[PDB]
Design a protein around this ligand. Structure first.
Ligand SMILES: *[C@@H]1O[C@H](CO)[C@@H](O[C@@H]2O[C@H](CO)[C@@H](O[C@@H]3O[C@H](CO)[C@@H](O)[C@H](O)[C@@H]3O)[C@H](O)[C@H]2NC(C)=O)[C@H](O)[C@H]1NC(C)=O
Ligand SMILES: *[C@@H]1O[C@H](CO)[C@@H](O[C@@H]2O[C@H](CO)[C@@H](O[C@@H]3O[C@H](CO)[C@@H](O)[C@H](O)[C@@H]3O)[C@H](O)[C@H]2NC(C)=O)[C@H](O)[C@H]1NC(C)=O
Ligand SMILES: *[C@@H]1O[C@H](CO)[C@@H](O[C@@H]2O[C@H](CO)[C@@H](O[C@@H]3O[C@H](CO)[C@@H](O)[C@H](O)[C@@H]3O)[C@H](O)[C@H]2NC(C)=O)[C@H](O)[C@H]1NC(C)=O
Lengths: 149, 47, 249, 50, 61
């Protein structure tokens, strides 16, 4: 049981109406392993990305679910000011249902010094899974023993 | 007893009676910044 | 499916001579803008079905301030039958754009209640003392919504009760908690940083009381300007259970 | 701190409603007053009580 | 106390004694908790930061 998920990214001046294929994500429900495989960006795409960063635009990510459409927006100014570091997280139910995803960047700054062409070559991403957690109940058995003892 | 300049006992008694009469009260604030370890000193009756 | 808006006086009772027309489809949602303009009056804007913003106090300075803020206001709409939690934001002058989207399967879970944070709430202490003398900082979020979902199927054992903690600014679930033997009327109260929600257990006939609290670490962040775009951290969540012999209407 | 114990009893002393009761408790509204420690509580439903 | 050169030095020891007594008093003062020098006491002073980029919504839909 291995299923592929489609991951698209957005890149425009101020609006967002164009979506392109970035890579393939493999997810295996029974094990719980999540793998990413995305292609490298071209020089023109890198230049457009740099131009968008100086325009404090928005980085929308589309992940269709088998239908539903989940989108997540992240500031790219901090992405360009710092090193490329995205963190992806899938949200699932108790069964095979998809809630949504969130993209989070560890630096999360706004200083904005400079970006070098050496920096934006490789994509640094990590995919994680967050299944629902079961809350605890009343621990009365220990209280009864403590009262008895 | 050991009478040694007895002026502290009367003032202590007067302060104790004044504090006993006034249980929960706020008289005035001091402009000086004070630490939180003197709070049991100062309030002594306010929760 | 008509929507109307009235402008009256709470002191005397007579209504004022200012009233805006309403057209298109019925008004969807509205929020109160803290910013004030004209004389000393606040701004109220409403959302229609066509995904457009309509401002009640039409004023040149009102529009100037709104255009100055521009990407500063977000909008989250929640549907029960649709089971779709999608978000929008204002761009430039007046236009709706999708930012964050969430879908929940209606057949499995169903939305019941959604509570948020009160606008008129000020926090005195932003931290707490700990064992020796070391300080502990809290996690206060002015923009955070908690949604409550219940199981559609009702059974003696199979019951699903859970709460989702999402940020209305950026789609991101902070903590998602799930019960296994809870059913019936569920009451949720939101506060400074602690959530109080009650339920009933089918296994043992009783009402369990779960208190959830968010806590940060020992070191603080910027602590000058708060924003949900930044702050890439996950706060600690604490849960406890008690017994309350009542119904809690 | 107090040792943890999952038992909450309804004390009769902590009863705001001494005699006046509300048949159906639809909701309650709390409004902050102006001094420091005073909140106006109004319970609505089948009756009104403040 | 000036009567000879050697006692002029013993006066310095007399001063050193009171200096070490002041050091002991300061040590007890800090051990008690008189001097704040701690994070909680400065948090007793920190003012809450301003909130920016407010949002809102409901469930009317
Ligand atoms: C590509 O991604 C990996 C993993 O996300 C990055 O590895 C991470 O690198 C950061 C700093 O470069 C490490 O942070 C360190 O954290 C420790 C405490 O955990 C702290 O003491 C250090 O001072 C430092 O801040 C982090 O541990 C490490 N691993 C993770 C996040 O799992 C890698 O650096 C990225 N590559 C590039 C070129 O950005
Ligand atoms: C904590 O957050 C505050 C508020 O976001 C940060 O203060 C703000 O920092 C920005 C970026 O340095 C300042 O912008 C500046 O604008 C001028 C033009 O007005 C420009 O010439 C500078 O290069 C810079 O971009 C902004 O003025 C400043 N606001 C205030 C009230 O000081 C602060 O830097 C953050 N601190 C940390 C540690 O993240
Ligand atoms: C709950 O309400 C009932 C009334 O329905 C209370 O019974 C009545 O209580 C009032 C005072 O709250 C009594 O009035 C008293 O009358 C005497 C003269 O008869 C007067 O001297 C007193 O100053 C006072 O005004 C009234 O007699 C009494 N009626 C009966 C039949 O007992 C009841 O006390 C209330 N429950 C409480 C307070 O716990």
């Amino acid at each position: 049981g291995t299923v592929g998920l489609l991951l698209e990214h957005s890149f425009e001046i101020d609006d967002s109406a164009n979506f392109r294929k970035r890579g393939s994500l493999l997810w295996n429900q029974q094990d719980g392993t999540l793998s990413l495989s995305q292609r490298q960006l071209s020089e023109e795409e890198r230049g457009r990305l740099r131009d968008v960063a100086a325009l404090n635009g928005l980085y929308r990510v589309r992940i269709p679910r088998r239908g539903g459409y989940v989108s997540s927006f992240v500031p790219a100014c901090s992405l360009v000011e710092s090193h490329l570091s995205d963190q992806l997280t899938l949200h699932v139910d108790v069964a095979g249902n998809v809630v949504g995803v969130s993209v989070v960047t560890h630096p999360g700054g706004c200083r904005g010094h400079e970006v070098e062409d050496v920096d934006l070559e490789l994509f640094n991403t990590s995919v994680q899974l967050q299944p629902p957690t079961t809350a605890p109940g009343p621990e009365t058995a220990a209280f009864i023993e403590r009262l008895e003892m | 007893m050991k009478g040694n300049v007895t002026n502290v006992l009367p003032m202590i008694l007067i302060g104790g009676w004044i504090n006993m009469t006034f249980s929960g009260f706020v008289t005035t604030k001091v402009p000086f910044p004070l630490t939180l370890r003197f709070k049991p000193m100062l309030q002594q009756g306010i929760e | 499916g008509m929507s109307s808006l009235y402008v009256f006086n709470p002191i005397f009772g007579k209504w004022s001579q200012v009233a805006p027309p309403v057209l298109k489809r019925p008004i969807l949602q509205s929020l109160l803008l803290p910013v004030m303009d004209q004389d000393y009056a606040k701004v109220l804007l409403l959302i229609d079905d066509e995904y457009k913003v309509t401002a009640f106090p039409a004023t040149r300075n009102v529009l100037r301030q709104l255009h100055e803020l521009a990407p500063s206001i977000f909008f989250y709409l929640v549907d029960a039958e649709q089971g779709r939690l999608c978000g929008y934001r204002l761009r430039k002058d007046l236009t709706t754009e999708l930012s964050w989207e969430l879908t929940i399967p209606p057949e499995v879970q169903r939305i019941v209640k959604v509570k948020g944070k009160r606008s008129s709430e000020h926090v005195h202490s932003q931290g707490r003392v700990m064992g020796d003398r070391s300080v502990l900082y809290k996690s206060l979020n002015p923009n955070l919504l908690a949604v409550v979902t219940e199981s559609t199927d009702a059974h003696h054992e199979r019951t699903f009760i859970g709460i989702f903690l999402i940020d209305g600014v950026t789609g991101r679930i902070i903590h998602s908690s799930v019960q296994k033997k809870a059913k019936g009327p569920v009451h949720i109260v939101h506060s400074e940083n602690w959530v109080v929600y009650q339920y009933w257990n089918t296994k043992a006939r009783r009402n369990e009381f779960t208190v959830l609290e968010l806590y940060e670490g020992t070191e603080q962040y910027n602590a000058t300007a708060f924003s949900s775009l930044d702050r890439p951290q996950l706060p600690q969540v604490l849960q406890q259970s008690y017994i309350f012999p009542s119904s809690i209407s | 701190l107090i040792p943890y114990s999952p038992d909450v009893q309804i004390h009769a002393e902590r009863f705001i409603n001494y005699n006046q009761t509300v048949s159906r408790m639809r909701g309650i509204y709390t409004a902050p007053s102006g001094l420091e420690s005073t909140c106006l509580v109004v319970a609505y439903g089948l009756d009104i009580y403040q | 106390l000036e009567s000879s050169s050697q006692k002029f030095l013993q006066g310095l020891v007399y001063l050193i004694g009171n200096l070490m007594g002041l050091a002991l008093a300061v040590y007890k003062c800090q051990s008690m908790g008189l001097l704040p020098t701690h994070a909680s006491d400065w948090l007793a002073f920190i003012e809450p930061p301003e909130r920016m980029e407010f949002s809102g919504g409901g469930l009317l839909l």
